[PDB]
Amino acid sequence: GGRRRTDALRFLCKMNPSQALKVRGMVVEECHLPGLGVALTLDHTKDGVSDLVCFVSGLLLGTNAKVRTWFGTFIRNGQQRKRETSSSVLWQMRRQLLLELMGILPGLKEEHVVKASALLRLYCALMGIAGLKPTEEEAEQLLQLMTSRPPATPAGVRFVSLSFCMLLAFSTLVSTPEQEQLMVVWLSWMIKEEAYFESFGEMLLLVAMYFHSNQLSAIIDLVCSTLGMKIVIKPSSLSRMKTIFTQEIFTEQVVTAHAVRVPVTSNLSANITGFLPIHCIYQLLRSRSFTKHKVSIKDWIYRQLCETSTPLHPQLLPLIDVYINSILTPASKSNPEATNQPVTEQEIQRFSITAQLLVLYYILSYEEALLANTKTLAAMQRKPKSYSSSLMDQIPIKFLIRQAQGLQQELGGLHSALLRLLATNYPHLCI
Amino acid sequence: DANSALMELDKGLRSGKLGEQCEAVVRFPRLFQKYPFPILINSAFLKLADVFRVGNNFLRLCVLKVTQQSEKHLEKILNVDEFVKRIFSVIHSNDPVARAITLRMLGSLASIIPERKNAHHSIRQSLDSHDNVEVEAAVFAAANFSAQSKDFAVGICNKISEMIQGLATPVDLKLKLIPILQHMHHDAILASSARQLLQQLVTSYPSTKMVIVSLHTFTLLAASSLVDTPKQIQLLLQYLKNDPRKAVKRLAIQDLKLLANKTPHTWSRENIQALCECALQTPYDSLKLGMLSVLSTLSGTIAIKHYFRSSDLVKLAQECCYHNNRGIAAHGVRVLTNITVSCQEKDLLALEQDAVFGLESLLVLCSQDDSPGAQATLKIALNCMVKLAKGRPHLSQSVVETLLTQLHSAQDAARILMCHCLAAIAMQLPVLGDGMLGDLMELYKVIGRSATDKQQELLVSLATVIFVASQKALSVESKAVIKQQLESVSNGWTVYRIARQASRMGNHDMAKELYQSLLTQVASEHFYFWLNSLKEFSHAEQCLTGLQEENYSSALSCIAESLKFYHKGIASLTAASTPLNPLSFQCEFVKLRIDLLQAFSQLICTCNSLKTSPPPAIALQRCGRISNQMKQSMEEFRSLASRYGDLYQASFDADSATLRNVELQQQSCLLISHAIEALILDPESASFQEYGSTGTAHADSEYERRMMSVYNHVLEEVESLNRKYTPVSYMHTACLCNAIIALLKVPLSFQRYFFQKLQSTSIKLALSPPIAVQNNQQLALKVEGVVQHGSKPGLFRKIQSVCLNVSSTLQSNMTNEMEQRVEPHNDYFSTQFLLNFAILGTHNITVESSVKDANGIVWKTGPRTTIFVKSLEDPYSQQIRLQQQQ
Amino acid sequence: DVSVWEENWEDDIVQDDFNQQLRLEMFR
Amino acid sequence: PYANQPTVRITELTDENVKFIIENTDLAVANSIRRVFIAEVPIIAIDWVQIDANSSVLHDEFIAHRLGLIPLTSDDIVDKLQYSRDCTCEEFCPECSVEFTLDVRCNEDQTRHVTSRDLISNSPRVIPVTSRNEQDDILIVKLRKGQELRLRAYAKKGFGKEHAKWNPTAGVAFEYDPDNALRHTVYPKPEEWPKSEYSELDEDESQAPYDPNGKPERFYYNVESCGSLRPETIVLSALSGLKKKLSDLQTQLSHEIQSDV
Amino acid sequence: ALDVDATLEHVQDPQNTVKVQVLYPDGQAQMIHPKPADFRNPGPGRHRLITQVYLSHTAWTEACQVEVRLLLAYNEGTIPFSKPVKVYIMPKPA
Ligand SMILES: [Zn+2]
């Protein structure tokens, strides 16, 4: 009955081509006869992104939950039965999608990269929501597309992040040794790439830390947010991915040397949330990784503080605390800020008021901790390196704490920390 | 948590070293923001008051800072008496700094505990103290308590009078002591006594600082106590003309500006005449600028109507319109513009051209130097240009002509501003297209090599005014525009904004040309789908440009070609949706356009079916098929009108122009349906006279103007054919098809809400949460929600209601119809509902949240929330029911 | 404050998330 | 110095039992969690019966004792109920009790089974476990012709520390270190010991190599509920109850600290 | 029971025009006409409406609040008069 009905409307729309997409709209609206709508989209073509990709992408990734479930049931049923008889129109649309995949493949070009990302999000929707189990040829060409090298344009960054998150989400599509080593060599080439970071490096560092800390649910949420849909994952394949990742792709040395190269979150605050490079640097600093692998972090901390905006992101104060504690370790320790840098920062070019408040909190906490930890010096006279008295004379402590008192609500724990530092260390300013 | 954090803060408090105590105390308000729980707030403030009582003065200062920051959480204090009692105890300390901090504490607590008479006595005794810090703290606390307590204000006014008149009080203390009197607005005799005191102050203490402070606080007091406003105005004018000091005159200007900003209607003709005399008389251009700013502020309001042919105001404004200084000229010509657009006397006809040539001179003056003050004066003059061309439309040809002749020579910023002004003028009247279009086009050629910064914005504004000027198709001109974009822009954001304006003004072919160029250079797939969908919509609308009047086969062909690209575009745009920023309005708007074009195609097909399917041998009736399909078309168009209506209602965040555009779509659907009815279905009983006051049809755009013109033509054509013919004649078909073709000929005009979302809002709608409930114990539900906001809450529409409607159904009919309208009062509403489920099945609960704005318009905006409730009886009740059922 | 064209689409300097993201992704 | 970071890994979530793994925690914490499962999870069971007719061969105490052991669906009622001693009513009030009635007369010449269906509740949420909608009901007593059983019984909140009927669990399979790496148990002949189900070892090995630095780190649970509460609810209620026990002890300790200093 | 006291200022004939209205958290608006004996007139121009008012319902899932509010009735047809006060209600099953 369904076959006869679909043949009847196929013949009707073949007799009246101008109203074919109207009938496709009726199919979508009534959630009835999905195969007819797919066939009408296919039969219509008998420049740029194809109409079929737009249609099935809007079906699977649109906000309409009922249409999503209805089409997912259609995809699952067509996949399960008939043992690939190629008579059902599902296989016709699979063939056309495979035609588009091969056509986009050459690295990728300036005009084809965004189309490739649209195709990858379509396959995201298919494998994740629709439960489609691809053929080995389909997976092979998908992997060929994934590992392609875009020309480092922002579309390239988006496409590479999409491909990486698809590798994480559907690692069950690898299931072969040769594609596994293809994946790892592509990953290593991505690591050595530098133009991508200036983002992709942020999420790469994030997934490295999640894997090292075995925070897989965070990986699931990150990949789901990146692709733009919720997917069932079955993290066992992700556990194998974690073992290969933390073993060869990311050890502590490469992740530290990459974390310093990650850009600082520009204009951060409590407004922008979720895990950030500040969290990753802080967790790495808590593990004393930068001094263990002889990795300079001072410039990153200075740049991060300089880029802070007017509300206070909560991780900055613990970051400064652990960083200062990292400047005080006997055998080897991180370097302090260079006297010049504070001088210019505080000078009378322009900097955020939070930048001044954080660097001032750094200076005051640093000197207080220096006077506190002196019982376990075990190092040369110049090793603690207390700041010059002239440096203190240049800093306007009272003026900046007046400013902090003015903008108290934004800063949060910073104003309280500054008041404690001022009361303990500069009582003559607390008259 | 709450308790954990409070315990940590108390631990910091007991620490006994000052640093940790101060840290904890100043940490308290952040805790209040974290957990606004009144038990926590009360206990925390009790601990703060206890550490305040015993603790050095710096700790007390930190506590004072907390209380000043946490003023709102003071309302949630229960043990007010104990808290204040232990705060108040330290007023007996012999240490004057401790007394000062205590007085400031009571001043911070004046809101929650006014009329605490011992506190009043402490303010009064500390007022005449010797320590300077204690006296200042007493003054501050007196200010707060006078703002709060009427009894304190009347008690303290005499003390303040004798304190100023006292001689041991130094001048600076007198100066701080005067503006307590601005809080004597509780009573009429109180205000009158304070006014008498202030008069004594200005006469007996004529120093510049003290007259400034006294006559400024007298202004504020008369502003609050409205009875004294006219005598305050006349005092200020008297001081403006008489007192020679520039500081006194400047204050008189600024606070008269304050009064004119708040109560312009109380200004008399005598006051305006006196101010005009002052402005004419003064030689100082800064003073002239100030009181002319006051005059412009008055002229904006109804005070000019109260002021009224030739007069000192008119002589002033003519004289100052051509002033050497730019600011005086700008204000004077604003005054001229306001007077011109207000009245319609026969002497004003000579005044309008004076105003026009004044605006001309301002354009010649302010269009070269590019200073920020020049930008201010240019904006004032251009807003005046827009105002008097809109208000006096017979004077717009000369306005546009001088704008055209000046656009060649002005700098880039002046070009941007004049293009904005010209775009407004052109949007308000359509009779000047091709000519000025050619001049702006020959201007457009030389934009490729103007500068590097303002070049992009100038290109956007110039293309915008080109599109507003244009009302037809252009090919070589579009080639020139596209060549300019490829040659000099190479950016895309400028191209995207220009394409946006092209879509807005209905120039869709060149918009398709630009949108197609932007597909390659985008980076995310969502924006790729969005730009592709815009390209398809623009191409689809341009397909309707090829329509022709009285050619219905061409109409069918063009509508089919349009619908194909429209369907491709709506598929692509649905692909553009994302969890964040879901294109709800764009999806629904395009879908209603889809359904409207399909309805038009069906109606034209049926009108052709009148002759393509003659009736049977049946001896309305005798035209059964055509009548039934007319009826189906009628139902379809009414449903389309209803869907445009609920789309309007779901568009709470949209700007007024987008709502009017959607309203026009709905009205076109209603027009077609009514034409069907009155020509075919019910002609006899549709005896309606189209006696609407069409003269006041203030069209806000050229697109809307064409919409009203075509509505009027279709309606009068229908009226001319009310009962002339049998309802299935070919003339009915011709009328309906011509209505469809004329409606489609005016191209679609997308609007701001399609492209650009502002003033977002939403409801979380938390409520008590497959839920069983005893049938007898009927459900008690708590429903609450917060109103989210994107940037400013009240940009377009203000929300003060939530008309939560809730219903119920069985076997998931309509048994629990009930609703409550709640004012949120803190952007958070909370209410309860009682729900009956005597039926022992499963009931689904559907709860809605419509919003009534300030004007009373209801917007179905809030989320549709559904839960399932299982209803059942206890086994004992079930068992006795079974025993009793037989 | 004072505005020439009351209904101007370029007035809003800081835009919503959609237009901000589209701007950054095309201002290059 | 400070708390651990205990992660959870659940392997089975059947409607009758839950099997889960807790890592990064002490042995004492895990064992106390097991003890709180058994003895400190309040449920509702019958603890007061009034027999006004019993012609059955089983005497009154027999019937009452059997009634107390019948499990009742304690889900979400125990959260809001109160202990009977803690309630202000002079009787069993609804805010602290659930009334059950039974009146079975065997007027037939064939044997009557007084199943758990005859326990009629005054509330629908709490009922005998078998009554929830396959499986047979609990037999209170068998009745021949002429014998009756009339009783009104009340169910109150209570925990296993007072009586076994308030135990929500039936078998708490707690196990750690299956491969005997810590050597907390010594096998004289380790080869003839069957491997545990959570063993990470192969068939060749008898026990794992000893690890001196190792401490009990991974704990294996299997909490089998008797049906009164969901096993996941049993675990969560146990955690909350242990936490509130510690909170009460901390409050009392702080009071004594105040009274002392 | 619910004892209700209100101070009514500048009303001519409160005992024939002032109606107490209660709103259960549903459509029910049970309106009460107090007897003329409870309208006292302790001072000129101001009254005292010392009235006991009775409420009832069936069992509720938990406590909720009923809005009790003064009304003013004119020659039929009535208007709100005062600020609606809500009072919590706890109907416990017997
Ligand atoms: Zn009780």
mmCIF file of C-alpha atoms in Angstrom, chain A residues 149-364:
data_model
loop_
_atom_site.group_PDB
_atom_site.id
_atom_site.type_symbol
_atom_site.label_atom_id
_atom_site.label_comp_id
_atom_site.label_asym_id
_atom_site.label_seq_id
_atom_site.Cartn_x
_atom_site.Cartn_y
_atom_site.Cartn_z
ATOM 1 C CA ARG A 149 44.114 19.429 5.463
ATOM 2 C CA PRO A 150 42.169 22.699 5.055
ATOM 3 C CA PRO A 151 44.118 25.885 4.218
ATOM 4 C CA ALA A 152 44.129 27.320 7.834
ATOM 5 C CA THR A 153 41.316 29.801 7.154
ATOM 6 C CA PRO A 154 38.709 30.200 9.952
ATOM 7 C CA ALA A 155 36.482 27.842 7.957
ATOM 8 C CA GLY A 156 39.410 25.434 8.172
ATOM 9 C CA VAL A 157 39.519 25.807 11.959
ATOM 10 C CA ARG A 158 35.776 25.120 12.171
ATOM 11 C CA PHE A 159 36.047 22.110 9.858
ATOM 12 C CA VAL A 160 39.028 20.654 11.737
ATOM 13 C CA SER A 161 37.237 21.019 15.072
ATOM 14 C CA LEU A 162 34.181 19.333 13.518
ATOM 15 C CA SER A 163 36.292 16.442 12.220
ATOM 16 C CA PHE A 164 38.048 16.003 15.567
ATOM 17 C CA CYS A 165 34.768 15.979 17.474
ATOM 18 C CA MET A 166 33.378 13.474 14.985
ATOM 19 C CA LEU A 167 36.476 11.295 15.556
ATOM 20 C CA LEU A 168 35.748 11.419 19.274
ATOM 21 C CA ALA A 169 31.988 10.938 18.950
ATOM 22 C CA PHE A 170 32.029 8.066 16.451
ATOM 23 C CA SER A 171 35.401 6.384 16.953
ATOM 24 C CA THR A 172 33.547 3.109 16.294
ATOM 25 C CA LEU A 173 33.705 4.037 12.599
ATOM 26 C CA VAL A 174 37.484 3.532 12.630
ATOM 27 C CA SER A 175 37.484 -0.181 13.638
ATOM 28 C CA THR A 176 40.636 -0.881 11.538
ATOM 29 C CA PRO A 177 44.404 -0.635 12.145
ATOM 30 C CA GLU A 178 45.354 1.344 9.040
ATOM 31 C CA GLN A 179 42.712 4.018 9.622
ATOM 32 C CA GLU A 180 43.790 4.164 13.272
ATOM 33 C CA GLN A 181 47.362 5.033 12.355
ATOM 34 C CA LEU A 182 46.025 7.445 9.717
ATOM 35 C CA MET A 183 44.098 9.094 12.549
ATOM 36 C CA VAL A 184 47.158 9.347 14.798
ATOM 37 C CA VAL A 185 49.392 10.774 12.047
ATOM 38 C CA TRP A 186 46.686 13.342 11.228
ATOM 39 C CA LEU A 187 46.503 14.238 14.926
ATOM 40 C CA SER A 188 50.279 14.677 15.169
ATOM 41 C CA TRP A 189 50.278 16.932 12.101
ATOM 42 C CA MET A 190 47.478 18.945 13.729
ATOM 43 C CA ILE A 191 49.594 19.283 16.879
ATOM 44 C CA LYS A 192 52.609 20.608 14.972
ATOM 45 C CA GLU A 193 50.333 23.114 13.208
ATOM 46 C CA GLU A 194 50.484 26.589 14.753
ATOM 47 C CA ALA A 195 48.293 28.886 12.625
ATOM 48 C CA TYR A 196 45.185 26.969 13.776
ATOM 49 C CA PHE A 197 45.452 28.271 17.345
ATOM 50 C CA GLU A 198 45.328 32.008 16.619
ATOM 51 C CA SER A 199 39.406 28.035 19.112
ATOM 52 C CA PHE A 200 40.766 24.651 18.059
ATOM 53 C CA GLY A 201 43.800 24.743 20.350
ATOM 54 C CA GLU A 202 41.548 25.591 23.292
ATOM 55 C CA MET A 203 39.296 22.574 22.810
ATOM 56 C CA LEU A 204 42.315 20.360 22.035
ATOM 57 C CA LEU A 205 43.927 21.334 25.331
ATOM 58 C CA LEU A 206 40.554 20.842 27.055
ATOM 59 C CA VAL A 207 40.095 17.301 25.752
ATOM 60 C CA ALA A 208 43.707 16.509 26.682
ATOM 61 C CA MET A 209 43.040 17.492 30.303
ATOM 62 C CA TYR A 210 39.701 15.675 30.399
ATOM 63 C CA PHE A 211 41.376 12.500 29.132
ATOM 64 C CA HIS A 212 44.267 12.853 31.597
ATOM 65 C CA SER A 213 41.814 13.364 34.473
ATOM 66 C CA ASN A 214 39.412 10.708 33.079
ATOM 67 C CA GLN A 215 36.555 13.223 32.848
ATOM 68 C CA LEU A 216 34.725 11.483 30.023
ATOM 69 C CA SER A 217 31.277 12.972 30.695
ATOM 70 C CA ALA A 218 32.847 16.392 30.186
ATOM 71 C CA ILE A 219 34.121 15.124 26.820
ATOM 72 C CA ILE A 220 30.587 14.021 25.938
ATOM 73 C CA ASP A 221 29.137 17.425 26.775
ATOM 74 C CA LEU A 222 31.960 19.245 24.963
ATOM 75 C CA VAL A 223 31.552 17.207 21.775
ATOM 76 C CA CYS A 224 27.752 17.517 21.965
ATOM 77 C CA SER A 225 28.014 21.303 22.290
ATOM 78 C CA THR A 226 30.575 21.505 19.480
ATOM 79 C CA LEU A 227 28.584 19.446 16.971
ATOM 80 C CA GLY A 228 25.266 20.889 18.118
ATOM 81 C CA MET A 229 23.187 17.856 19.120
ATOM 82 C CA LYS A 230 22.903 15.197 21.806
ATOM 83 C CA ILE A 231 24.432 11.810 20.958
ATOM 84 C CA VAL A 232 24.647 8.482 22.765
ATOM 85 C CA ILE A 233 28.338 7.651 22.981
ATOM 86 C CA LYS A 234 29.039 4.296 24.749
ATOM 87 C CA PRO A 235 32.373 5.552 26.191
ATOM 88 C CA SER A 236 34.220 2.195 25.944
ATOM 89 C CA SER A 237 35.478 3.132 22.475
ATOM 90 C CA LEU A 238 36.299 6.497 24.008
ATOM 91 C CA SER A 239 38.269 4.637 26.683
ATOM 92 C CA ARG A 240 40.378 3.018 23.945
ATOM 93 C CA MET A 241 40.682 6.473 22.365
ATOM 94 C CA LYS A 242 41.771 7.762 25.770
ATOM 95 C CA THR A 243 44.475 5.124 26.132
ATOM 96 C CA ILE A 244 45.921 5.886 22.689
ATOM 97 C CA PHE A 245 45.521 9.647 23.265
ATOM 98 C CA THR A 246 47.146 9.956 26.696
ATOM 99 C CA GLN A 247 49.799 7.431 25.699
ATOM 100 C CA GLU A 248 51.140 8.655 22.368
ATOM 101 C CA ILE A 249 49.247 11.788 21.323
ATOM 102 C CA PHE A 250 49.346 13.732 24.603
ATOM 103 C CA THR A 251 51.827 13.167 27.370
ATOM 104 C CA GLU A 252 52.401 15.840 29.992
ATOM 105 C CA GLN A 253 55.338 17.358 28.095
ATOM 106 C CA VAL A 254 53.515 17.991 24.828
ATOM 107 C CA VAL A 255 50.325 19.132 26.559
ATOM 108 C CA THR A 256 52.305 21.640 28.672
ATOM 109 C CA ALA A 257 54.280 22.977 25.709
ATOM 110 C CA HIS A 258 50.982 23.232 23.834
ATOM 111 C CA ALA A 259 49.099 24.819 26.751
ATOM 112 C CA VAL A 260 51.529 27.720 26.916
ATOM 113 C CA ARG A 261 51.047 28.214 23.180
ATOM 114 C CA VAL A 262 47.235 28.358 23.594
ATOM 115 C CA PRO A 263 45.794 31.899 23.310
ATOM 116 C CA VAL A 264 44.604 33.631 26.453
ATOM 117 C CA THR A 265 40.851 34.037 26.856
ATOM 118 C CA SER A 266 40.444 37.649 25.806
ATOM 119 C CA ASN A 267 38.159 39.755 28.028
ATOM 120 C CA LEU A 268 37.158 36.977 30.377
ATOM 121 C CA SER A 269 34.809 37.478 33.309
ATOM 122 C CA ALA A 270 32.064 35.694 35.166
ATOM 123 C CA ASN A 271 29.947 36.425 32.065
ATOM 124 C CA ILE A 272 31.587 33.790 29.867
ATOM 125 C CA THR A 273 31.435 30.379 31.502
ATOM 126 C CA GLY A 274 32.361 26.765 30.973
ATOM 127 C CA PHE A 275 35.857 25.361 31.175
ATOM 128 C CA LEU A 276 38.481 27.661 29.736
ATOM 129 C CA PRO A 277 42.273 27.778 29.179
ATOM 130 C CA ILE A 278 42.571 29.434 32.595
ATOM 131 C CA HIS A 279 41.118 26.263 34.125
ATOM 132 C CA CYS A 280 43.555 24.081 32.178
ATOM 133 C CA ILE A 281 46.569 26.229 33.103
ATOM 134 C CA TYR A 282 45.405 26.272 36.716
ATOM 135 C CA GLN A 283 45.020 22.483 36.824
ATOM 136 C CA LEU A 284 48.432 22.112 35.201
ATOM 137 C CA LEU A 285 49.913 24.571 37.690
ATOM 138 C CA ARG A 286 48.317 22.616 40.532
ATOM 139 C CA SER A 287 50.236 19.572 39.307
ATOM 140 C CA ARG A 288 53.511 21.590 39.139
ATOM 141 C CA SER A 289 53.775 20.553 35.505
ATOM 142 C CA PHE A 290 55.397 23.694 34.088
ATOM 143 C CA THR A 291 58.430 23.508 36.359
ATOM 144 C CA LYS A 292 58.598 19.720 36.025
ATOM 145 C CA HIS A 293 58.935 19.966 32.238
ATOM 146 C CA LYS A 294 60.834 23.307 32.373
ATOM 147 C CA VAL A 295 58.020 25.218 30.716
ATOM 148 C CA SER A 296 57.823 28.996 30.994
ATOM 149 C CA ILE A 297 54.398 30.208 32.114
ATOM 150 C CA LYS A 298 55.078 33.776 33.307
ATOM 151 C CA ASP A 299 54.337 35.444 29.968
ATOM 152 C CA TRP A 300 51.059 33.534 29.679
ATOM 153 C CA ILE A 301 49.990 34.613 33.170
ATOM 154 C CA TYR A 302 50.933 38.235 32.463
ATOM 155 C CA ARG A 303 49.049 38.235 29.157
ATOM 156 C CA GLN A 304 45.998 36.607 30.757
ATOM 157 C CA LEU A 305 45.882 39.154 33.587
ATOM 158 C CA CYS A 306 46.384 42.029 31.140
ATOM 159 C CA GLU A 307 43.412 40.809 29.062
ATOM 160 C CA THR A 308 40.936 40.622 31.967
ATOM 161 C CA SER A 309 37.620 42.488 31.745
ATOM 162 C CA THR A 310 35.518 44.298 34.360
ATOM 163 C CA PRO A 311 33.659 41.412 36.051
ATOM 164 C CA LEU A 312 35.974 38.938 37.680
ATOM 165 C CA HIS A 313 36.217 35.402 36.440
ATOM 166 C CA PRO A 314 36.346 33.287 39.624
ATOM 167 C CA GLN A 315 39.418 31.270 38.664
ATOM 168 C CA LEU A 316 41.851 34.199 38.550
ATOM 169 C CA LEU A 317 42.477 34.470 42.293
ATOM 170 C CA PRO A 318 43.217 30.730 42.839
ATOM 171 C CA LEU A 319 45.362 30.923 39.711
ATOM 172 C CA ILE A 320 47.446 33.724 41.208
ATOM 173 C CA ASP A 321 47.669 31.857 44.522
ATOM 174 C CA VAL A 322 48.927 28.605 42.998
ATOM 175 C CA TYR A 323 51.200 30.533 40.631
ATOM 176 C CA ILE A 324 52.831 32.401 43.522
ATOM 177 C CA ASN A 325 53.197 29.119 45.388
ATOM 178 C CA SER A 326 54.849 27.812 42.220
ATOM 179 C CA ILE A 327 57.353 30.687 42.390
ATOM 180 C CA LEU A 328 58.406 29.282 45.795
ATOM 181 C CA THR A 329 59.751 25.711 45.385
ATOM 182 C CA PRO A 330 63.419 25.126 46.359
ATOM 183 C CA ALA A 331 65.077 22.943 43.683
ATOM 184 C CA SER A 332 63.311 24.597 40.739
ATOM 185 C CA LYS A 333 60.407 27.012 40.472
ATOM 186 C CA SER A 334 58.574 29.306 38.071
ATOM 187 C CA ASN A 335 59.862 32.810 37.441
ATOM 188 C CA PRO A 336 58.205 35.984 38.780
ATOM 189 C CA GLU A 337 56.945 38.941 36.805
ATOM 190 C CA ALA A 338 59.696 41.179 35.464
ATOM 191 C CA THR A 339 59.797 44.489 37.414
ATOM 192 C CA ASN A 340 59.615 46.449 34.144
ATOM 193 C CA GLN A 341 56.232 44.862 33.248
ATOM 194 C CA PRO A 342 54.435 46.001 36.547
ATOM 195 C CA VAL A 343 56.043 49.458 36.125
ATOM 196 C CA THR A 344 54.598 49.949 32.638
ATOM 197 C CA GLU A 345 51.289 48.342 33.650
ATOM 198 C CA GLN A 346 50.742 50.804 36.509
ATOM 199 C CA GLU A 347 52.183 53.860 34.645
ATOM 200 C CA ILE A 348 50.062 57.023 35.256
ATOM 201 C CA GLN A 349 49.432 52.144 27.506
ATOM 202 C CA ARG A 350 45.885 51.805 28.823
ATOM 203 C CA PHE A 351 44.935 48.759 30.870
ATOM 204 C CA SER A 352 41.810 47.368 32.462
ATOM 205 C CA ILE A 353 41.205 48.297 36.070
ATOM 206 C CA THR A 354 41.001 44.565 36.806
ATOM 207 C CA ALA A 355 44.440 44.203 35.228
ATOM 208 C CA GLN A 356 45.813 46.726 37.729
ATOM 209 C CA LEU A 357 43.928 45.136 40.615
ATOM 210 C CA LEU A 358 45.125 41.617 39.764
ATOM 211 C CA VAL A 359 48.739 42.650 39.285
ATOM 212 C CA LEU A 360 48.550 44.595 42.574
ATOM 213 C CA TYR A 361 47.085 41.566 44.330
ATOM 214 C CA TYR A 362 49.922 39.561 42.805
ATOM 215 C CA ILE A 363 52.559 41.987 44.113
ATOM 216 C CA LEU A 364 51.083 42.183 47.599
#
